[PDB]
Design a protein around this ligand. Structure first.
Ligand SMILES: O=c1ccn([C@@H]2O[C@H](COP(=O)(O)OP(=O)(O)O)[C@@H](O)[C@H]2O)c(=O)[nH]1
Ligand SMILES: [Mn+2]
Length: 521
């Protein structure tokens, strides 16, 4: 039951005790002699001295465009929804604030429940063998709110699964454990899925500083890099969209090849029929790109909602064998393109659970999921590699005259010079070519682009990174029409003369198979 309800306290006044004083004892203002690096250290990314001093009913600004406030929903016609917050060792202030923001900002008749999932927390206030601070504080919240636990820590997929299974409503929404909503955040999501159950709709994300906690606005279309992480459409990538979509209205829903994180809503039935999540994914990793490829390919639709805004606390501080498994398993959905991605993350040989993954290959064909080439040709044709014929060359860039190859000289990360070293055949000495934008990059970072300076730097789809690889073997920078020379084991730009053997290179052609055979375990 809701006691004292009203605008901004849609579920009533939360956290009050029998005697009327609040059930949370807020903290004093952070000390004046307060070293920010130590505070983010002891807070796991946040300034917890401040969060503990801020109110759990903190009032946030409306990050929604003005046109979003001019819409009217009918809360009787909308399907109830289960919000699912999953947390591992989230502090009390941030966690309880996220919950307050949801209950205060979600009409109760469209919020079936609010499920808090303990993914094996090891803190006294969240542990069943300790303070019991969380358990006792929950008794001061609506009945909608129920806690459930994982015996041990199962990770992102494992805990969202425990949470989604427990839901009751037709629709479930997933929220982080360190967030604040803007008003009317859930109404747009319910309305969009009511009209088509196949749609997974995600809110657009604003920020909360992890040092000052100032609210900050934020950015819909998202692609992916061949290192297998989401990547917001670069400027030259929106320029390929149709004109009618290059600059979309701030109230319209627009699609997205990928989802950035795990803040989305979906119909529980459709979600379970479209594959749900790969429960052999380990801890935190590439689940976002494997749920995104699978959704689109198996008759789904992914779009963001500019009228559905949620604030998130991006951190400023703090396994490894897990992120490479999640990536190999994501390649199932990439078909022949998995060769390229496999090479970019370093030809990794791991135990990707080949048994369960073959039962995901069976499931994939039983549903008749569309190919990854379908994906690239119809969902992400703005990308730079829509077919593997767009990667004409992958291998060493060798200069026969001096008998040396290029070398990232250690790392592929942007911002450091390239060198000429004796050829040894390792990935450090392998480079790829993207022809749609003329990018000479190290195979291990498709965000790193060679420049006439001889230095790698961040890739931009522009003329300052465009290279032509001529048929004589030259690396001609398009804007100056000068060619690259290895003279004196130094890299300088010179006049183009196909008779100059110091500027003529050899680059391995890239003709991968039509099917990718996974690397043995
Ligand atoms: O084992 C885990 C890993 C993550 N999460 C939650 O999943 C969400 C996304 O993870 P997080 O934001 O911590 O990842 P990050 O971006 O910090 O690496 C957050 O609400 C986490 O608390 C969780 O409950 N258990
Ligand atoms: Mn987060």
């Amino acid at each position: 039951v809701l006691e004292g309800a009203g605008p901004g306290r849609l579920h009533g006044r939360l956290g009050i005790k029998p005697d009327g004083q609040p059930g949370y004892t807020r903290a004093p203002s952070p000390p004046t002699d307060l070293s920010m690096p130590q505070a983010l250290a002891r807070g796991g990314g946040f300034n917890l001295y401040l969060s503990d001093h801020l109110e759990l009913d903190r009032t946030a600004p409306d990050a929604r465009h003005a046109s979003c406030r001019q819409l009217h929903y009918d809360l009787s016609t909308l399907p109830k929804a289960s919000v699912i917050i999953v947390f591992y060792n989230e502090p009390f202030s941030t966690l309880m604030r996220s919950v307050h923001s949801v209950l205060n900002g979600t009409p109760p008749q469209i919020l079936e429940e609010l499920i808090l999932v303990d993914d094996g927390s090891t803190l006294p206030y969240i542990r069943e063998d300790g303070n019991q601070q969380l358990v006792e504080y929950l008794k001061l919240l609506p009945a909608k709110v129920r806690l459930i636990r994982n015996e041990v820590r199962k990770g992102i997929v494992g805990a969202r699964m425990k949470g989604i299974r427990a839901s009751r409503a037709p629709i479930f929404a997933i929220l982080d454990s360190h967030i604040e909503v803007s008003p009317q955040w859930l109404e747009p999501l319910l309305l969009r899925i009511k009209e088509d159950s196949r749609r997974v709709v995600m809110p657009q994300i604003d920020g909360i500083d992890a040092e000052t906690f100032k609210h900050i606005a934020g950015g819909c279309k998202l692609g992916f890099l061949w290192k297998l992480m989401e990547h917001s459409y670069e400027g030259h990538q929106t320029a390929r969209l149709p004109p009618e979509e290059r600059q979309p209205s701030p109230t319209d829903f627009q699609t997205s090849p990928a989802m950035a994180g795990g803040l989305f809503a979906a119909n529980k039935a459709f979600f379970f029929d479209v594959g749900a999540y790969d429960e052999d994914f380990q801890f935190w990793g590439t689940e976002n790109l494997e749920l995104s490829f699978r959704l689109w390919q198996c008759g789904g639709v992914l779009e963001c909602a500019p009228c559905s805004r949620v604030y998130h606390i991006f951190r400023k501080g703090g396994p490894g064998d897990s992120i490479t498994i999640n990536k190999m398993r994501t390649m199932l959905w990439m078909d022949e393109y998995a060769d390229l991605a496999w090479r970019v993350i370093g030809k990794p040989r791991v135990n990707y659970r080949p048994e369960s993954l073959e039962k995901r290959r069976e499931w994939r064909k039983r549903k008749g999921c569309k190919s990854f080439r379908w994906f690239m040709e119809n969902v992400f044709p703005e990308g730079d590699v829509v077919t593997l014929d767009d990667v004409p060359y992958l291998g060493p860039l060798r200069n026969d005259k001096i008998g040396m190859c290029l070398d990232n000289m250690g790392w592929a990360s942007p911002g450091h010079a390239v060198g000429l070293e004796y050829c040894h055949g390792g990935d450090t000495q392998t480079f790829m070519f993207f022809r749609k934008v003329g990018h000479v990059m190290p195979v291990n970072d498709d965000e790193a682009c060679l420049q006439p300076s001889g230095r790698l730097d961040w890739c931009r789809g522009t003329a300052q990174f465009w290279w032509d690889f001529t048929s004589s073997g030259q690396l001609m920078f398009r804007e100056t029409k000068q060619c690259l020379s290895a003279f004196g084991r130094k890299l300088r730009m010179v006049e183009c003369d196909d008779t100059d053997p110091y500027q003529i290179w050899s680059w391995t052609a890239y003709n991968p198979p039509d099917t990718f055979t996974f690397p043995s375990v």
